[PDB]
Every structure is written in C-alpha cells, then in structure tokens.
RNA sequence: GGUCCGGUAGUUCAGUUGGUUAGAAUGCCUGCCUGUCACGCAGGAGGUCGCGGGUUCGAGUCCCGUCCGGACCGCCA
RNA sequence: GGGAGUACGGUCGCAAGACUGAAACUCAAAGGAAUUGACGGGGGCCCGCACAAGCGGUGGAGCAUGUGGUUUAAUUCGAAGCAACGCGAAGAACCUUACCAGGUCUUGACAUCCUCUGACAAUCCUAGAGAUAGGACGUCCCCUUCGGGGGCAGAGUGACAGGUGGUGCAUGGUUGUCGUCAGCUCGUGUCGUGAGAUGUUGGGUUAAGUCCCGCAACGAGCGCAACCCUUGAUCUUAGUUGCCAGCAUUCAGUUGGGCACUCUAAGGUGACUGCCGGUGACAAACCGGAGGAAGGUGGGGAUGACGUCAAAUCAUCAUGCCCCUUAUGACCUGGGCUACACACGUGCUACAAUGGACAGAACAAAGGGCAGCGAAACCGCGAGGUUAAGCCAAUCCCACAAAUCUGUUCUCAGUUCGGAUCGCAGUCUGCAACUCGACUGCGUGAAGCUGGAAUCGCUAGUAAUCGCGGAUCAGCAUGCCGCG
C-alpha cells in the first residue's frame, strides 16, 4: 500500500517536440523494441502521403479526438450493483486512450499492421474510429449513471 | 529384500551395461552423485557433519 | 520442518572440514576411504570416548590425529595398542598411515562426549530428567555460554513419544557468528530408540 | 355386461391436430464452485410412440381389432 | 436434572384453563460466577500480486508427463485440500525390479564363528538362461632357531544369516505447512485464593514484541535486526594460459614488447539517518535536500521461534510381533512397471503477415571435459562416419548462441500456418531398440482460424519471450537446476 509513481522511457531533456519524442522514444507499447518500433514509424510515414501535413500534429489531434473525461466505476453497496462515475486522471487519461488505440490497431483487421495503425491514425483524427465509438459509448453511459455519486 | 542386489553390485554382472551405479554408504540406487558415489541423504548427514573437504553451503 | 544444523551451516565460514586434504580424480575412494575408517576408530575406541578425527593426506600417505581426554591412557601403557590399531590401519588404507593423539581440556562441554553420555545413562536406566539436569549444569559449571540439551522417543511412556528439553543462558542458532557444536546420539533400550541431540554454544567469534 | 376416454425419455406432462420435425420440466452423466456435501453455474444423451393388423409417397398422430387402466350406466316390476 | 406443573382426585371457570399436586422409570450429572483460548453473517487499527490497475496464461485443439478408474499374469510399492498428483524417480530394453509366468537351490545372495584341506578361485571347449558334466595351469601365498604359525580360500557342519514380510497410531533420524508471521516464553516480585493476571497492556512510532515515553512491575531468553554469501562504486597488491594504451609488425596481441586499461581474486575502502533544513515535546521517529555508484534493512540469497496437521516417511534406522530355510530367503530367463472405453492436473507446441520461407550481418553469461572432451580436414544431403591436432584446461575442446537487424518472396487462405499420426529408407548406443529409446532423409499430411462456466502467475531487468549449459548418463528431458 501507497501510491507510488514512475518515469518510464521518456526521450532527450532539452528541445523535445513531441515529433522528436516519439521519433526518439514514447508509445512503442506493441512488445519488445524491434518490429515495434519500425511499424510504428511506418504507420507514421503512411498518413503524411495521405495528408499532406504534419504527422505528430494529425496523431495528437486523434489522440485529442480519443480524449475521455469519465469513467465509471462498480460499487457493492446495495443488491443492484450500481456503477458510479470518477474524474480521470490526466496519466490514466493518456494510457487509456493508448490503450484502446492499440488495441483496436490490431483488432481493426486490414492486410498488415503499418496500414492497420495508418487508417487508425486517420480515423482517430476524424471521429469514425471504433476507439471514438467505445468512447462515446463510456461517455453516454457515464452520463447515464451520472446521479449516484 | 534390499542387501542381495547390493552383492549383486559389487560383484560383477555378465555385460557392461549391467553395472548401475549405487551408493555403498546407505544402498540407494537412485540419485547418487558420480563425484562422490554417494546418494542423497547419507551424503547430506556427513556434508553437514564435516567430510567431503570442499563442500560448503551455498548462498547467491 | 526442523532446523539447518548449525555446524552444517558454519563448515567454512567457521568451522573446518576435518579432512583438510585434497584429491581429485581419487577423490571417490579417498572419501569412502574416510568414511570407512572413522567408522574403525568410532567403534574401536569407543570405550575411551572419541569426538572427531582430522585426516591428513601429505604425500597421499594418511595422517589422522584424535582428540579427547580420556585416551590419555590411549597415550600411556597402551603405546603397545596404538601401534596395534595403526597396524590394522594400514591393513585396511592399502599405503600406510601415521596417527597422533590430541588430549582436550574441558572434555565436559564438547558435544559428542555429551551426547555419548546421555546415551549412556539413558541405557542405564536414570530418568531423562536427572541425566539432563546435572549434565547441563555441568557444563555451564565448566565454562559454557549457554546449553540446550533435546530428548525424544518413548520416554517411559511407550504407548506415544514425546519430547523434553531444558535451556538457558543463551543459545542464539540464528546468529552465524556464534561457536554451536552440534551432536546427535541414539540411546538404544528395550523400549526400542531413543533420541538424544545436544548443542553448545561457547560464545561468538570475532 | 354395454358406452366413452387415454396408453409417449427413468418419472410427470406437451406433440396426439398440421399424415410429410418427436418436445418441456424433473431425473441421470461430465465439468465448474465449495474444505466436503447441498444449493447455484456451464455443457450432454435418451424415447422412436401399449400391441397387432389394414389404407397411402409416407402414419406418433388415419381406420379396425387385442391388452392395460379410468369414467359413466346397468333401470320398471 | 428430567419425568412434571404432566397423571389422578378435589376446588373454581361460560370456556380457554387456574390452584392443589405424586409416582413409576431414567440419568451422573445439571447448574451459578469467573479465567484462558477459539469463534462471531460483533467492533476498533494494520499488512500480504489478498483484491483492485494491467500484462501473459490455463482450461478449446494436438502432444509429453503424473494421477484416478478399468484391465491384465503383473500393470512393484509409497504419496491424497491448500500443505498428493514433470511427486520419491537428478532418466525402467535386461539391470534397476520389489511384481508376474516358468525353470531352480536350501548354513544359503551374505556376515561372524567351528572342524578339516590347506593359499586360492580363475580361465576355454559339451548340452547350456541359471547351473550341471569332464578335462586343461588347475587348487600353486608369506613368515618360518624350518618344529610350526600367519594370510586367504575351498570343503563340511551347527549355532546362525537374510528379509523393499506390516505396523509414521510404538519410534529415532528426517521433511513440508501456517509463516519469514512477529509472535512465543521464563526468573524474581506484586494482585487474586483459585483458574490466572501484570512483564508482553496505554500514548507515539517501525518491515518487526523496531524503538521512545508512560505504567507494579523489574529484568531475561527464543525470536526480529545485525554478524555470512552474492550483486552494485573505488584503493592497493599480482600481471599469465587475460588484457593492447601509447609502439613496431600480423590472417588474427599474431608476434616483438608492456600491465596502461579491462579482467582475474585477495586484502581493503565505502552508507551508518552520517550531515543540513523542517515537522514532531525536545523523546523515538517522520518528511525533503545536499551530497553520494549506492539512502533510509541498496537488491537478492542463506537463515524458519514456541507450536499445529496422531501430516508423510518402518524404502537410511530399530525392542515389537509375524516369514522360513522342503520360503514372505536366494538364483535365472522372459514379461510388467510404457495397457486404454474415460476423467483430473501440470507442462510443451500451435491456430499465423508485429508472420512464414530464403540469403546475409552480428552481439552473451555460466558451466563441463581422461575408460573424457574430442579440433581442423576428408566422406556422407542428413543423422553421422574416417584418419585423427590439442587439452587433467583463464592456453585445447565442448561451442557456429538464439531472439535481434538488413534485404527478397509469400499475399490473409485450414494456407509456403500448424505439424499430429502413419508407410519407406537410414544414424547412434547398447548382448539386444518387439512390448520398449532417441535422432536423420523422405512421402503423407491431422485437428486447431484464440477457446464456456470458471480459474492462475506476476510490482521493472520483473513479467513475457530468446536461446545456452549442468546433473542423472552406454542411449534417452517438453522435466529439474542454473546462465545470460
């Protein structure tokens, strides 16, 4: 017991654009470095031949566009199993959204995985991604259960 | 029935492969060690009562 | 289950091997060797009481000193049966052997010749008790730190053992830097076997 | 003695009408839970239709007869 | 104490019932108050991958192994919730092996003695698994004032020997478990009468009965921590079978040189809340910094208290009973311990494109090696074969690490996935590979397209993956132990 917190993996001190930080270091949750790391850059290459634009800008915008606020938790008191709502905190916030954006990465199913996280990428950007789908989907449902608290 | 096969040991067999190995300190047949032609509890009794010269207990 | 022994535990770090030789690739029938012939000397010289025995292996030629006190007339008239028990020692090592005896002040607080002890009165029937008690009074009387002394087996009571004990000073087991010399002996009486285990300990080692 | 009913998994009831599929609880078996047992949770099989005969491409379910039970009636002197 | 405020009989009552009130029979207790424990779907604090937060799994499939059940001549015994079930067994073709079938023997596989021959069996032919039958050196040593003794067997004999023949509920010696939990107790003294209490409770604090302050307790011990090992930073010593820095020369420190550096391994130095600041009564501590390789027991290991499970072990040991010597004791061969309608567990491998195939490039640690490791080279597609160098090893060998990275191809399918099971031909070992070993080249190619109810491990070099050694060992490892 007691909460304890760590650095993990965090790129060069000084200078560090988040382009640079994740060309460097960061994300890379796929396994161990190799063919993790590589695909990643793939998939980052594959979106600034589709939109002529900035990469990171495009990413953090999707990984702004994935952003939740609430999420719920269960309780035991009573027979009925009510669920209540917290606050999320920022870092639970950006591992989460992580998270799902991995996860339905390779879940989405196209030929290979540099295209998979690419669409991903874009369709996180929009909001037509399964990751926005199941975000919405807490967000409604938290919306829901507002009233316990 | 354990001290007929152990003179079954010492002396010889027919063939070379039917000479297994034992501990002639307490007769087991099982588990001995070739550096020392010693099974497991009798060489445990005399490594913590002293012999065997280099033995010691490890810790790493 | 029960303990680590402590003396196990201490080999090299404080205690010795008493076999301080090496051999390799002869090191197999060096060490039955070893064992065969302090079973000679355990149940030879019994009636004069042997605690442990260092051999020596100088030139391949063994070397074997003895301790304990009681031997003294070992050393005396009995010059004529060391030499007859080294000639059957070197009857039984093949290459020849050269023994010495070692006298021990204070026999009273060494383990074996505890344990020997208790063994022995237990076979001739003094209660478990009264063997414990005066013995171990008598080697904190001699100088000792602190004693347990251990009994188990059906001790009168044939129909379930148990087991006894006594202690006090201080015996601290968990503590490597302490001197612990360690015996186990089997008391043998018509009631079948009965255990006797005694530890010592004489203060730590700096 | 006459008339009317039904005869289905081990048990109790649907299907028996739809001529053109044999089902539901319970029981039983296996696995899970429990310290163990019981509850509780996942899975699974079974009958081939009282019997015999006849019609039809095809009868559990149509039509006769046999057997088993049940209901009703067996009255006037 | 029940029987029982029941039966009977009276007395009231409208009734329900009320009052009065036995016995037979039966038990050896029932009770009151208090103490220590345990427990509570009682309360107050605290911890532990205990749950949460996540990651990877098991059960879905095949295969390996253990176990249950069934069967056999026997499937040798023991193990049974955690705390039995890749367990004894760190290796079953005979051996092991105990079990079964058959063929055998009886002072005997074997030990101590007795009495004789006295040194003795070996070795090859005949049937032949034992073992018998006859020959061949065949029963032949050493000390011996040479009389006779000793060793070292043979023959014969009687005391005896042998029991994995049961009893962990007779046992010693062992081991797990709670639990690495912080508890467990004692001397002396008080209080109660006694059971017992106080110490060990209270306030604060800690990983801790750790510590501090209180307090009829004062102390002490087993405990805890430290002391040990290893891993982290450095100094000195010593530079070869290690190192290559400035040098010169090579295919390569290879040499010529030299311990500089790494390293080796000894001796050491270092971390102790030490210091500062703050909180806390100033106490104990707590918090944050400076330093420091390391900071709050640095990490890990070893280390298992009193006790609990009548836990297990009569398979190391041993009164006790029982087994016989015309057998529960020996010998031998062959079989069995590996069976198979099912179930359970623990593991391995897959279900794929974060992939598969093919080529290339690398980068470890830790061990082992003499009836042993066995180099290079040659042969063989390959398992391996042949002559063989060196190494009792910081020289030599095992020994080409793999994952990884770069490139080409495959293009999402039961597939260039997956390899199960089979047929054929071989390799090694071993007297021997059928029951019943492993490996190679072939051909064939299974189910399986992430697994119900459930359920497990895991707080960072961990998990998850990647190979590599060792033991056991003729040959056999998906298991174990350890290494990076």
């Given at each position: ?66 952003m939740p606020v609430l999420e719920v938790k269960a309780r035991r008191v009573g027979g009925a199993n009510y669920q209540v709502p917290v606050e999320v905190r920022p870092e639970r916030r950006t591992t989460l959204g992580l998270r799902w954006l991995v996860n339905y990465a390779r879940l989405r ?41 | ?60 | ?167 006090e000073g201080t015996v601290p087991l968990h503590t490597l830097r302490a001197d612990i010399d360690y015996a186990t002996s089997e008391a043998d009486t018509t009631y079948g076997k009965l255990g006797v285990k005694v530890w010592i300990y004489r203060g730590e080692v700096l």
């Amino acid at each position: 017991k007691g909460p304890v917190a760590k650095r993990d993996v965090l790129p060069d001190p000084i200078y560090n654009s988040k382009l640079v930080s994740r060309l460097i270091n960061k994300m890379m949750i796929d396994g161990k470095k190799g063919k993790s790391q590589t695909i990643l850059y793939k998939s980052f290459d594959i979106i600034k031949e589709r939109t002529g634009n900035d990469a990171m800008e495009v990413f953090e915008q999707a990984l702004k566009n994935i952003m939740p606020v609430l999420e719920v938790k269960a309780r035991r008191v009573g027979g009925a199993n009510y669920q209540v709502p917290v606050e999320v905190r920022p870092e639970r916030r950006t591992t989460l959204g992580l998270r799902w954006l991995v996860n339905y990465a390779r879940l989405r199913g196209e030929k290979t995985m540099e295209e998979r996280l690419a669409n991903e990428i874009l369709d996180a950007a929009n909001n037509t991604g399964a990751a926005v789908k199941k975000r919405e989907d807490t967000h409604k449902m938290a919306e829901a259960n507002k009233a316990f608290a | 029935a354990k001290k007929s096969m152990i003179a079954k040991q010492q002396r010889t067999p027919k063939f070379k492969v039917q000479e297994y190995t034992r501990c002639e300190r307490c007769g087991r047949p099982h588990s001995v060690i070739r550096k020392f032609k010693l099974c497991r509890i009798c060489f445990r009794e005399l490594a913590y009562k002293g012999q065997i010269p280099g033995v010691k207990k490890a810790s790493w | 289950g029960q303990k680590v022994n402590p003396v196990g535990l201490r080999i090299g770090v404080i205690r010795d091997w008493e076999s301080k030789w090496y051999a390799g690739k002869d090191y197999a029938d060096f060490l039955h060797e070893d064992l065969k012939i302090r079973e000679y000397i355990s149940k030879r010289l019994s009636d004069a009481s042997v605690s442990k025995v260092e051999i020596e292996r100088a030139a391949n030629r063994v070397n074997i000193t003895i301790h304990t006190a009681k031997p003294g007339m070992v050393i005396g008239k009995g010059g004529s049966e060391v030499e007859a028990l080294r000639k059957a020692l070197n009857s039984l090592t093949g290459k020849r052997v050269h023994i010495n005896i070692l006298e021990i002040k204070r026999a009273d607080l060494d383990a074996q010749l505890v344990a020997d002890n208790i063994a022995r009165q237990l076979e001739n029937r003094v209660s478990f008790r009264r063997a414990q008690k005066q013995q171990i009074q008598r080697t904190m009387r001699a100088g000792a730190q602190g004693v347990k002394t251990m009994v188990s087996g059906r001790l009168g009571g044939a129909d379930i053992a148990r087991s006894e004990y006594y202690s006090e000073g201080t015996v601290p087991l968990h503590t490597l830097r302490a001197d612990i010399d360690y015996a186990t002996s089997e008391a043998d009486t018509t009631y079948g076997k009965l255990g006797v285990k005694v530890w010592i300990y004489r203060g730590e080692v700096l």
